[PDB]
Ligand binder design. Structure first.
Ligand code: FE
Ligand code: NA
Ligand code: NA
Length: 186
């Protein structure tokens, strides 16, 4: 009567700051995608969506997030997923930024990260606009231009597959330093 099966990412699966895995440069995924890499991708997206629904997030004790990277699950593979409420909801395999605007931006409230628990003061300067290239679960290759929030989320996730944490962009002694005309989103 009941079809197939799958797993569900639980908060315990998300490793925390200090875990060395978060600092490695994730490995490139092989194509065509394995049924294992496709599943992980799906498990990652289900999570983000789940963490964003009050009832599910609550019943499943999840912390809301809009982006996630395989390394955070302790899987060093270049795979990320983003789910931005109404607009952008996909899994990206071997994502790579091909170009960016000169214009910079940042989240006025500061970026979040399921992997860090401490509160980190400051602004993280990002490219207002970017063009990302990657592969979906089908094997289809995509090239898309993103801006503002979505651009920030993706840049934040790709940093993860390169062993980079958001607070690495924050000048510890001048946390809120910003150049002129930087678009602060909030
Ligand atoms: Fe993060
Ligand atoms: Na898992
Ligand atoms: Na973020």
């Amino acid at each position: 009567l009941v079809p197939g099966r799958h797993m569900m990412i639980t908060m315990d699966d998300i490793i925390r700051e200090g875990n060395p895995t978060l600092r490695e440069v994730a490995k490139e995924v092989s194509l065509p995608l394995s049924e294992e890499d496709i599943s992980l991708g799906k498990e990652m997206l289900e999570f983000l969506k789940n963490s964003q629904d009050p009832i599910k997030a609550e019943e499943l004790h999840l912390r809301g997030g809009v982006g996630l990277a395989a390394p955070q699950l302790d899987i060093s593979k270049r795979i990320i997923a983003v789910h931005v409420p109404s607009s952008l909801s996909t899994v990206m395999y071997n994502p790579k930024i091909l170009s960016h605007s000169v214009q910079d931006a940042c989240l006025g409230e500061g970026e979040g990260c399921l992997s860090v628990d401490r509160e980190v003061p400051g602004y993280v300067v990002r490219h207002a606009k970017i063009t990302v290239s990657y592969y979906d679960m089908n094997g289809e290759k995509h090239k898309i231009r993103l801006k503002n929030y979505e651009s920030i989320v993706v840049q934040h996730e790709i940093d993860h597959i390169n062993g980079v944490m958001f607070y690495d962009h924050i000048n510890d002694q001048n946390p809120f330093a910003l150049k002129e005309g930087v678009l602060v989103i909030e």
